[PDB]
């Protein structure tokens, strides 16, 4: 039960690792949360350029209120995608490193 | 050397 290209190889690399059946069983339930972070990040990754074009379209209109309102939503939206960016990366590094060490010996 | 000693 996986779709992300990053997660798929991790599960494949997990089945060749040192993981005990209980460790392997708990490993899957962590990848499920890891994908949810990615799909949340991916969803906002679209929303950044959608609102970026929305911000650009409004700036061409020239209304100071709509420009200010969209910008206020925009910068907070950038924080949302930026903050989720590291959380995905941090979780990716730990998961990749753990299977790297489990396959190291 | 190969001696076990």
């Amino acid at each position: 039960e996986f779709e992300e290209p990053r997660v798929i190889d991790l599960w494949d690399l997990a089945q060749s690792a040192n993981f005990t059946e209980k460790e392997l069983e708990s490993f899957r339930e962590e990848l499920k949360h890891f994908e949810a972070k990615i799909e949340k990040h991916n969803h906002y990754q679209k929303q950044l350029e959608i609102s970026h074009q929305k911000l650009k379209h409004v700036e061409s209109i020239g209304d100071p209120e709509h420009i200010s309102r969209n910008k206020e939503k925009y910068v907070l939206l950038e924080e949302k995608t930026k903050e989720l960016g590291y959380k995905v990366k941090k979780h990716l590094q730990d998961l990749s490193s753990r299977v790297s060490r489990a396959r190291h010996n | 050397x190969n001696x076990x000693x």
């Binding site: 460790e23 949810a36 010996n105 | 076990x4």
Partner: protein, 1166 residues
């Protein structure tokens, strides 16, 4: 549609209540509830559970920094508490009642007048700063201050802001609450508030007492130190190292590393009894599990953390992986955690770490500035853990999650070498090896720890004996043993789905699929070592020993084999020259034989006929012994260097390897006849043999050519495995399933490769001191039968010996001194050819077990026979004592001379210490050295180093912080003074690493510098095949042979291109596959007329011919003349021979078997 957000949005279903602000009005997570965090997770104040490893990894994980809340101590982020001020000269804060009170309180005088820097304790600033509440004097001027519960605002320094009084370290013992209603202290059940801020034990509990080890004996004393009772004195020169106690059963448990045993006694005395006496060679520490009545203990010979019952049974090994030097241990059964300290790990770093009480989830609790953690105690009510350091000389505290790190005592002048630690109420009780005393110190901040029972030895253990020290709880394993078949071990309360326990299995069994029923284990990897013989699982998922390790103080184990029928393990101890057998769980150990052994290289066990074989490198022979009756026969003799022996019962052959200069692998019948070479070419140093039972092939390792080969049992179809990466000196090997488990001497590790071509080498265990043999324990392969094990009649009708023979036959044999009769099945005594022999020579005492030692070893106070036969009944009936011993005045006992006047009372009547004159001679200590008050000379550089080099504490006396280091010493900043030899030694001795700061390496020409410049290695390790350097720079750029050729120093085989040393060309023996190294152009060799010429080309004296010794080393001088009576006195380059011609390929080409064609050896297509 979807989840309509608080302001009308189609928020996805899984976004709500994911610990994230998703709704635009911050309302997407209010109406639900979350999960709680399991024992392996950290709750980050928002309900978000994160991995325990993410706590203080240096990275904020909860946009609150809740998991990095100051896990480094003594930092720059002071922001000091109310009524405090910072003197600019250092990272220190001092309360206002001290600041400018007239006395220097920052040690540098930075809180009093310093005219040299133009600073005075002024007050004029208040006149214009206009303080909101109050003012005080500082070296800056009048400083504004505000009452407790509030701190000076940092924008202006004139206003003051509401502050949490509960956040100051030590505001109240245990816990405090009521922020709005001013700070107030709460004391839990059994505790009452006295004087305020001081929790005190309830009167309903018995008087608190401190039990501790003064260095040799267990002592007991009350908190105030008014009385001191000796609870248990040590016997047989013992030593009480680590103590602990159970309150409900009122028992005290302590470990005696010297006697090598664990003891338990009642608190009032009496009922003293041993708890463990096997495989506890060094029980460093101890901790009881009062809730489940278990006894966790730390063992350091074979590094592990075991679990036993309070009476010693049901041993289970919990944590073994990566343990290098476990020293401290503590646990909290209420929540389920287990804490232990490791002052050196195999990876290199020392660590204080947390785990469940079954070792499920290990987490490095403290890693930075950890040095040598030596003892762990924990505040069971505030949820904190206290540990000490002997190297950086501090006592420090972190939460159960390791978040809030705080220091309570530090500095070499305060805690030079703490070992143990315990706490009660508000005082931490720790023992120190340098001040040689138990010490009392406040649990929050101690400026000068008070003394408590100063001792004359190293105090090794301390713990507080009180009821409140062991809280009151319900064990999950109390419900019919938790359903576990054998052992029920606790865990974290949230583990196992909330049960709070897991079932464990004893040594001889394994846990089934239902993790409830224990079944007998069938296979595990058995390997020996210089230190111990250990059995480990074949899979690397769990690295916990499956059998209890076999160990001894004097020990060198080399040969091993197993008997799966009775679950016993045979082994040989090269230091005692005794062959033992021991059960898997360690219960029953006896000796197989101990007579006439010199160096038993390898054992092997014929599981069907029950005959134990072993090679003897000293006697140069192999011996077979039967177990049912101790018949013994030396079947093969006159070898040169026999190392490895493997016996094949069903097939009938025994296989053997000799690594002398004409090395060969020989095979013979189990009888010992038909001894013929099986592999005697292209071979040198065949250190080990193994049989692939699934395919009937014989594997062996070569330590000279650094290769693994295999062949059929006839020596034909010989194939060579692929190149193994770092195998440079293999010793032993075994074959189990698809993999071969090779042991390496130089690596000191067990490596695993595939039996097909080698392939994916995986290291099983690194760091073995001297690994020696490996063996695959397997109950499946120890089955089957032949004519030696028919059910209808006894052992093949042979009386003493029956041996399997190829083509499924059998032959009989007879012991030494006994001859097979005409029936070929029954034996009779033959005193004519094999007359009786005594246990051993004259200048030796025959011991009971079969050993015998040089006579003068009789009655010298040392057990040399290893069964106390030579020390039995000394000093009576002219059964006298050796000069090397000390005789007791009334007789009946003799002790080693080192025990005479040694300050220990060894002899029963005390004669060994009575009338002992002093040694206060007229002697000088060298002026380059320092004189200990014990009158032992130490280098003058070892003074005030916080180490007790004098063993009396003289060198560290008067070493207060007010002082210098000697001109030949380096100063650690407010830590200690060290010898310059520790400056750029490689490791940080300083608390802040000032000894290793920014200096560069001076590697000599006898050494090689790695490319990364990290470290140097000896020139011998340059270009050897092992990556000594971290970046593998030592092996980069190393010389190689030309493709298909050999170095100028070597010689190339014509048949198959094998490279052999140049000396092996023209040395009489065909070291090549087709005799290429003994061609017709070989100049022969002769010897002197007074010398005989052996078949292999050696020269031996005229009188030495047939003298009875293997002078020729190939038996030529003995086999030749037996007349000794009874008396009482071409495609390539060609070479010409007499009529034929010899076709020689050029180097890099190999000859085809037809004898004319040559083939290029390089795989490069032309």
């Amino acid at each position: 549609k979807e989840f309509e957000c608080g302001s009308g949005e189609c928020i996805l279903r899984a976004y709500v209540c994911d610990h994230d602000n998703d709704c635009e009005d911050n309302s997407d997570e209010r109406n639900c509830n979350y999960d709680t965090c399991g024992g392996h997770q950290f709750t980050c104040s928002n309900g978000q559970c994160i991995n325990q490893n993410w706590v203080c990894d240096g990275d904020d994980d909860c946009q609150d920094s809740g998991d990095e809340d100051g896990c480094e101590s003594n930092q720059s982020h002071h922001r000091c508490y109310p009524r405090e001020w910072a003197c600019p000269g250092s990272g220190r804060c001092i309360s206002i009642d001290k600041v400018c009170d007239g006395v220097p309180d920052c040690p540098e005088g930075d809180d009093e007048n310093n005219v040299t820097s133009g600073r005075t304790c002024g007050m004029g600033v208040c006149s214009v700063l206009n303080c909101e509440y109050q003012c005080h004097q500082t070296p800056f001027g009048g400083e504004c201050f505000c009452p407790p519960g509030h701190i000076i605002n940092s924008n202006d320094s004139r206003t003051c802001i509401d502050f949490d009084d509960c956040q100051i370290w030590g505001i109240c013992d245990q816990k405090c609450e009521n922020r709005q209603g001013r700070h107030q202290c709460l004391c839990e059940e059994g505790y009452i508030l006295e004087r305020g801020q001081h929790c005190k034990s309830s009167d309903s509990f018995s008087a608190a007492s401190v039990i501790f080890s003064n260095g040799r004996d267990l002592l007991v004393g009350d908190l105030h130190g008014r009385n001191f009772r000796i609870l248990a004195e040590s016997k047989n020169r013992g030593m009480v190292m680590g103590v602990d106690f159970h309150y409900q059963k009122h028992r005290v448990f302590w470990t005696d590393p010297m006697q090598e045993k664990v003891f338990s006694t009642d608190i009032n005395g009496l009922n003293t009894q041993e708890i463990l006496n096997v495989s506890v060679d060094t029980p460093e520490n101890l901790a009881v599990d009062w809730i489940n009545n278990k006894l966790y203990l730390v063992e350091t010979k074979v590094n592990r953390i075991d679990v036993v019952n309070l009476e010693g049974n049901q041993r289970v090994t919990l944590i073994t992986e990566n343990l290098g030097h476990p020293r401290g241990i503590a646990l909290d059964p209420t929540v389920g955690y287990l804490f232990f300290s490791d002052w050196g790990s195999l990876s290199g770093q020392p660590k204080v770490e947390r785990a469940f009480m079954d070792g499920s989830n290990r987490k490095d609790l403290v890693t930075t500035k950890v040095g040598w953690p030596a003892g762990i105690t924990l505040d069971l009510v505030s949820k904190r853990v206290y540990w000490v350091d002997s190297r950086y000389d501090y006592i420090e505290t972190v939460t159960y999650d390791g978040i809030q790190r705080k220091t309570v005592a530090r500095g070499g002048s305060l805690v030079p070498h703490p070992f143990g630690i315990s706490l009660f109420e508000e005082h931490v009780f720790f023992t120190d090896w340098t001040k040689m005393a138990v010490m009392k110190a406040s649990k929050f901040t101690e400026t000068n720890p008070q003394v408590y029972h100063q001792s004359s030895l190293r105090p090794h253990g301390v713990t507080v004996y009180h009821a409140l020290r062991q809280p009151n709880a319900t064990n999950p394993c109390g419900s019919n043993n938790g359903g576990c078949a054998q052992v029920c071990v606790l865990s974290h309360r949230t583990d196992n789905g909330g049960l709070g326990y897991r079932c464990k299995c004893e040594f001889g069994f394994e846990l089934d699929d239902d993790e409830h029923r224990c079944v007998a284990v069938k296979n595990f990897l058995l390997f020996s070592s210089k230190t111990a013989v250990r059995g480990i699982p074949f899979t690397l998922s769990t690295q916990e020993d499956v059998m209890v390790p076999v160990t001894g103080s004097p020990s060198f184990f080399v040969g091993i084999d197993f008997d799966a029928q009775h679950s016993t393990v045979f082994y040989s101890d090269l230091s005692k020259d005794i062959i033992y057998k021991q059960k898997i769980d360690g219960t029953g150990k006896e000796v197989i034989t101990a007579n006439r052994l010199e160096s038993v290289e390898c054992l092997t066990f014929d599981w069907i006929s029950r005959n134990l074989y072993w090679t003897d490198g000293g006697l140069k022979s192999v011996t077979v012994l039967r177990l049912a009756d101790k018949s013994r026969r030396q079947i093969i003799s006159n070898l040169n260097n026999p190392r490895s022996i493997v016996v094949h019962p069903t097939a009938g052959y025994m296989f053997l390897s000799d690594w002398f200069r004409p090395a060969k692998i020989m095979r013979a019948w189990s009888d010992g006849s038909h001894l013929m070479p099986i592999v005697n070419t292209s071979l040198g140093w065949p250190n080990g043999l193994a049989i692939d039972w699934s395919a009937s092939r014989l594997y062996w390792v070569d330590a000279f050519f650094d290769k693994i080969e295999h062949s059929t049992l006839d020596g034909l179809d010989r194939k060579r495995l692929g190149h193994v990466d770092q195998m440079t000196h293999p010793f032993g090997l075994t074959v189990f399933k698809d993999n071969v488990f090779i042991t390496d001497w130089r690596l000191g590790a067990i490596i695993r490769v595939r039996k097909s071509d080698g392939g994916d080498m995986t290291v099983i265990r690194r760091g073995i001191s001297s690994v020696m043999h490996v063996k695959a324990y397997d109950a499946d392969l120890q089955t089957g039968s032949n004519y030696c094990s028919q059910t209808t009649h006894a052992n093949g009708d042979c009386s003493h010996f029956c041996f399997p023979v190829p083509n499924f036959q059998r032959v009989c044999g007879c012991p030494y001194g006994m001859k097979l009769q005409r029936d070929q099945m029954t034996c009779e005594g033959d005193p004519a050819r094999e007359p009786p022999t005594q246990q051993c020579g004259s200048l030796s005492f025959p011991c009971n077990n079969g050993k015998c030692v040089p006579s003068f070893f009789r009655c010298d106070g040392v057990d040399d026979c290893h069964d106390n036969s030579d020390e039995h009944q000394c000093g009576v009936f002219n059964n006298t004592c050796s000069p090397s011993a000390f005789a007791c005045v009334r007789g009946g006992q003799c002790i080693p001379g080192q025990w005479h006047c040694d300050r220990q009372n060894d002899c029963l009547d005390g004669s060994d210490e009575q009338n002992c004159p002093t040694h206060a001679t007229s002697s000088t200590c060298p002026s380059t050295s320092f004189t200990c008050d014990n009158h032992v000379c130490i280098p003058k550089d070892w003074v005030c180093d916080t180490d007790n080099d004098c063993s009396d504490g003289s060198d560290e006396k008067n070493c207060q912080a007010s002082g210098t280091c000697q001109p030949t010493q380096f100063r650690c900043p407010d830590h200690r003074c060290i010898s310059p030899l520790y400056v750029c030694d490689g490791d940080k001795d300083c608390a802040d690493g000032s000894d290793e700061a920014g200096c560069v390496l001076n590697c000599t020409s006898a050494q090689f510098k790695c490319a990364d410049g990290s470290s140097c290695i000896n020139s011998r390790y340059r270009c050897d095949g092992v990556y000594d350097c971290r970046d593998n720079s030592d092996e980069a750029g190393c010389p190689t042979r030309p493709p298909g050729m050999c170095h100028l120093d070597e010689f190339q085989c014509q048949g198959d291109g094998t490279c052999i040393p140049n000396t092996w060309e023209c040395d009489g023996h065909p070291d090549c596959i087709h005799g290429s190294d003994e061609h017709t152009g070989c100049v022969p060799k002769t010897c002197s007329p007074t010398h005989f010429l052996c078949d292999n080309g050696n020269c031996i004296y005229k009188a030495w011919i047939c003298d009875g010794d293997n002078d020729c080393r190939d038996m030529s001088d003995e086999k030749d003349c037996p007349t000794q009576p009874f008396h009482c006195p071409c495609s390539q380059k060609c070479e010409n021979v007499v009529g034929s011609y010899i076709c020689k390929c050029a180097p890099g080409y190999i000859r085809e078997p037809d004898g004319k064609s040559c083939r290029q050896n390089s795989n490069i297509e032309p």
